[PDB]
Symmetry: D2
Subunit: 252 residues, 4 copies
């Protein structure tokens, strides 16, 4: 859309997005590709991944995909290595992959707790760990960790997810301190209730909750999040680090 | 600088900046003018205002201004009315004017308290009040209120300034709730220690404090803040409202 | 009530409460009096003040009252002087007086803005200013500034009140830094929606909002706030300073 | 110390503390025991646990304990069941056990990540899970989760610990929402730099950092935290839930 910004510093920039095949992940892939970045992404959904790359084949750089289960850290490290060979040293990382499946407090088991941490928090740390050397060599970079307003609203229904997403604050801040001396910014990008393909299907009370919660009476869309990530990855935000950057219509 | 973003939605957009003639105010005026906006500003200092407009006369629109004292709400309102006559309805307001002069707790008088509130907080409210109808007519807009990390760091030296700048949170949030039904966003933009003053001129302890405080060991510049204001005023940030948008190298 | 704490350090302690005649102010007066403190309070409502002192005449110390309009700083300073003569150097100050009268954005005038700041924020600063020397002489003390969840929830209906109450954060933090070297703690005490005599009179939507907002489905009462203030004024909280101490059932 | 509060509601109250044998854990055990509570604790170190109970055998109730490894959720659950047999239904839980061992970003492995989450966050969830039914039966209760200012200060040196301690916010808030309908409060208790280590033993720079950070130039002690936990577990704090209750001298 011609109304929105063009970021010269993203042209040719190596950008890695996790969980990139669907949802806001796919919006990140599309937006970066349309800015001329050299995008790569990982996901489990190979069919969706191929579709996304195909509809972006007319970008400056067709996005690169590697299938990966991000609960498997060895696999993730291998995928990042394979990606670096194709797009070069990673300059921006969007730690997006998540799973907000509901779970009752009483039903949580040690294994289900661990799985929730694995699919929401743990890979953010290990993906960051794997790109630091690249960013040092580049003279800086930007790591964008996906958070959530879930815990900020004190939502019921998924206590380990709320915990995992609040954890991102600590991850972001700790990494920002250690990586800032190398020009690496680390920020948490916090979506509100994003209307995706998966998310008029609510009941009246759900619509009322969004309208009462948000200050702005409009649907939050993937592109709202993606444009914020563009700015955070671009040179334009070089002194923004350790922030909780909330894009939510004013709810939380 | 050709590395930074261009925002097509700012071309021709009417933007009003308070305290525009010096400091970060002048950086906001210049950045908006260079994006092609129709900029107006107010400032106490007619000479500084004249100089700023003159050196931006080669922009798409030469910035216009009214010299006045915004502790005088009648004068502020008259200035905004005169500006609206010259640039049309206001689409973005940057509520920037401030005065951080130091004051000891014991030296504060009722008059000096009131003056500090007048020059730091009060005009933000009244400038906003004066542009709401324009933004409602336009179908949206963006109000950017300047905050400060002073109170976040619990700085000594200016307790009424710390109070006035913390107050901006409440102003922002209250306005965001009432104005959001019309597509008007209201955010607080929070600078760190901006080198308008510079690190080199400090003593060893002063330099050390900034280096220890910030995550990134680089000088924060007016342009870091101005680029964030561009994004907040542009269509790109349509669902970002009620935020404390901190640009400070990771200090606060 | 015999179930609640007894604070030995409050016995005989000089405690000043502003706006003490009604509402949570009166609850502070009662609670401190029942702990054996030497209480004084200021208020405009002389009838209510006399009633409150009369029903507490059987405490260790009958509370002392001085009528005062806290928009008049000279009067406030005079009242504090008169109070010090009766209860001794002030060891704890509860900056409680407030007025949350609703006001439309469009209806705010320079005078009404100023009056809202005067009756909500300004006297907190000046009462603090007037007790610092006492607390230095005592070797420490505790200043408790009343805040509000209004601005935290981004409530509509009173933008200058929201601003004034957010300002308390800056006041508290700035004072905490400067006064901490003298053992003076400064904290913001933040009530939720307190059910007072003034506040089953809501409509169904109002009750639903409180039940949806609070985590705990019970009425917040003055005593919930008053017990927190006891702890903050007592020796028990000697290392708690610069906090936003929220007592609200989990809403904000 | 006769200067501090006595909480009548803690007499006979069943209180469970994790990591009870050392550090602030032992201070919690002692303070609750001296208030007349029926204390139980778990700890890895059977010898330290035995010593602690022995030196508190003159309390109204000698503390009881189970030595176990709370990275083993089966063992934790078995311990809590054995404790409930000995002290009755649990009315207050202090989720204290932690390990802040330093770790370089590059040295973190999947195993070491998981172990850090296990010893800092995971057991908080499972201990809470194990006491909910008791608190529902009792008609209320208090769960106090230990946080940290580490991540608030953006400390380097232990990124997974910072992550795990930030996660506690989400755990607290999520549990507070679901448990509040039963009168169960859930709060995060956040210590500063507690002198368990002491200022005198630091180098000049270390002392300076605490003096510059804290508003109050005094050593934070275990008792500062323990008294706050008493208040949070006592009836006195019945409407305080979902909070980050920071006891840190004004640093964070």
């Amino acid at each position: 859309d011609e109304r929105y910004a063009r970021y010269p510093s993203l042209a040719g920039r190596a950008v890695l997005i996790t969980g990139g095949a669907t949802g806001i992940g796919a919006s990140f892939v599309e937006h970066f590709a349309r800015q001329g970045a050299r995008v790569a992404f990982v996901d489990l959904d190979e069919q969706a991944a191929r579709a996304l790359a195909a509809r972006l084949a007319d970008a400056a750089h067709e996005p690169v995909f590697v299938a990966c289960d991000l609960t498997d850290i060895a696999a993730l490290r291998g995928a990042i290595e394979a990606i670096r060979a194709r797009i070069g040293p990673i300059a921006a990382l969007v730690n997006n992959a998540a799973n907000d499946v509901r779970h009752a407090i009483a039903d949580v088991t040690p294994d289900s707790f661990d799985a929730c941490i694995a699919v929401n928090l743990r890979h953010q740390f290990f993906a960051a760990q794997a790109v630091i050397d690249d960013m040092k060599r580049l003279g800086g970079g930007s790591i964008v960790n996906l958070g959530s307003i879930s815990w900020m609203l004190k939502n019921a229904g998924y206590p380990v997810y709320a915990s995992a997403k609040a954890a991102v604050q600590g991850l972001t801040r700790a990494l920002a301190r250690e990586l800032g001396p190398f020009g690496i910014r680390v920020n948490t990008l916090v979506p509100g209730w994003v209307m995706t393909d998966k998310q008029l299907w609510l009941d009246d009370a759900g619509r009322a909750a969004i309208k009462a919660g948000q200050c702005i009476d409009a649907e939050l869309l993937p592109g709202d999040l993606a444009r914020m990530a563009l700015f955070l990855a671009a040179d334009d935000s070089r002194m923004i680090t350790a922030q909780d950057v909330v894009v939510d219509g004013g709810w939380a």
